[PDB]
C-alpha cells in the first residue's frame, strides 16, 4: 500500500501564531486524468469524528475558515493554519485516496499558553463507599498549565507514593487549560489508620505548594 508520513508528530503553538505541518507520500498522488492530487486533510477534535478540511491538496471544503490552507503536489504536501485559535486543538491527518486509502500518523496540535496555577479541591471517601469496604480519596486540580505537575499526597506528615492514579482532561478549547484528577486508593483498614490527608500541588508559578486537606476525626 501507499505509505504516508507526517511531521511533526506533535507540536505546541500559541494562539495567533502560524503552524505548518507536512505530509509525504511514497508515490505520487497526482491523477493524470483529472490533474488533481488525491490528498486530503482532516481535523479530529478530541472525542469527535474526523472532519474534512481540504481536498485536492489545496481546495477548502465549504465553510472551512481560510486560516486553513493546503498546498503541494505529487509526494509533498503541507497544511498551514495561519493564526492558530484555541479551538484548533485537534489531531490533523493527511489522507491519500489515489489508490486505496492511507492516513498519515497525525500531527497533534497542543495550544501553548501562559503558566497557570490550579484550583485544588479534596474529597474524602464517601460514606457510601466506606460502607462497601473501600476508600478512594479524590483531589481535583482545575484549570492549570502546563500539563505535567508535581502532585503529592501527604498522610500525617509522610508522602504516600503508592496507590495514586492521575488523569487529565483534554485541553479546554476556550482557555487552553488542563484539569486533572488524583485518586488515592486505600483499603478501608489503611484509610482508618491515619488522620490527616493532604493533596499538594507544586506548580511552576510558585515555590509554595497549593494544599487542600481534611482530618478524618473531623468528619
Amino acid at each position: 500500500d501507499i505509505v504516508m508520513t507526517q511531521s511533526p508528530s506533535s507540536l505546541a503553538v500559541s494562539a495567533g501564531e502560524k503552524v505548518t505541518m507536512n505530509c509525504k507520500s511514497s508515490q505520487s498522488l497526482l491523477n493524470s486524468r483529472t490533474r488533481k492530487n488525491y490528498l486530503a486533510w482532516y481535523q479530529q477534535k478530541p472525542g469527535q469524528s474526523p472532519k474534512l478540511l481540504i481536498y485536492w491538496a489545496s481546495t477548502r471544503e465549504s465553510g472551512v475558515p481560510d486560516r486553513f490552507t493546503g498546498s503541494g503536489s505529487g509526494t509533498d504536501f503541507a497544511l498551514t493554519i495561519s493564526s492558530v485559535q484555541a479551538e484548533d486543538l485537534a489531531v490533523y491527518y493527511c489522507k491519500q485516496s489515489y489508490n486505496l486509502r492511507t492516513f498519515g500518523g497525525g500531527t497533534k496540535l497542543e495550544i501553548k499558553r501562559a503558566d497557570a496555577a490550579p484550583t485544588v479541591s479534596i474529597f474524602p471517601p464517601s460514606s457510601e463507599q466506606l460502607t462497601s469496604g473501600g476508600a478512594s480519596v479524590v483531589c481535583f486540580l482545575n484549570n492549570f498549565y502546563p500539563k505535567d505537575i508535581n502532585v503529592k499526597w501527604k498522610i500525617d506528615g509522610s508522602e504516600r507514593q503508592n496507590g495514586v492514579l492521575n488523569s487529565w482532561t483534554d485541553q479546554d478549547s476556550k482557555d487552553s487549560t488542563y484539569s486533572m484528577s488524583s485518586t488515592l486508593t486505600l483499603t478501608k483498614d489503611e484509610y482508618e489508620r491515619h488522620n490527616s490527608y493532604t493533596c499538594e500541588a507544586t506548580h511552576k508559578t510558585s515555590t509554595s505548594p497549593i494544599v487542600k486537606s481534611f482530618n478524618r476525626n473531623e468528619c
Binding site: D1, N31, T34, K36, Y38, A40, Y42, Q44, S49, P50, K51, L52, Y55, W56, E61, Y93, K95, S97, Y98, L100, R101, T102, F103, G104, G105, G106, T119, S121, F123, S126, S127, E128, Q129, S132, G134, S136, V138, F140, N142, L165, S167, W168, T169, S179, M180, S181, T183
Partner: protein
Amino acid sequence: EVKLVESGGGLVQPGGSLRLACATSGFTFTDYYMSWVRQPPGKALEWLGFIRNKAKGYTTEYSASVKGRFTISRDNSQSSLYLQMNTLRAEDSATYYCARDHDGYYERFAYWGQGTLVTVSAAKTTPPSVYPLAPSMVTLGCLVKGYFPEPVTVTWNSGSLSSGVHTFPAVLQSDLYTLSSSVTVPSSTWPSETVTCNVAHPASSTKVDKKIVPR
C-alpha cells in the same frame, strides 16, 4: 440529513469473530463507495477497506494490515454495510467508523459515523459503583468505580448541566475501570437547586443517578 450509525460492537472475547453493522440513511446508498476505518485508543486512524458502488459492481479492497482476515459486505436492500472481523486479538480493540466514500475525485462526499467501540478482552462485564463527591463557585463530583468495558456516559442533571464539567478519562486497573467527573457551579446554584450525576453503562444495561447532598 446524511446519517451513518455503527452497531454490533462492545465487548468480545479474543479468538472468534464479530460482525459490525452500519445503518445508513439520507442518501442513495448504492451510488456510493463505503469504507471502514478504525482508531485504537490514543493511536492514529487506520483505513481498513472499502466496497465500491453499483457502477463498479460492489467490488472490495482491503489494507495490507487486514487483507485476508477482515471482509466487507453490503445489504443494498437495507442500505447497510458490514465489517466481518475474524480471529480477533486484544489489539483489534478500537473505535470503528463507517464512512461514505467515492472515487478520489469526489473526496468531498465523505461523511463519517460517530463510531463504535470494540473491546477485545477476556475480562467480564461489571457495572460501576457510583459515589457522590460532596464538599463564589463550588466543585462537586461523582466517582464512577469498578466497571468494564468502556464506555460509560456521565451527565449532570440529565445533560442540562454541561458547562463547568470535567469528566476524566478512565483508568484500567485489575480488569476494571474507574473515573471521576467534577462539575463547578455557582454557589448560588447549590444546594438551593438539585445537582445529580447520571451514569449510563450500556454494556451492563445500567443507568444510575446520584444526588449530591452536603456533607
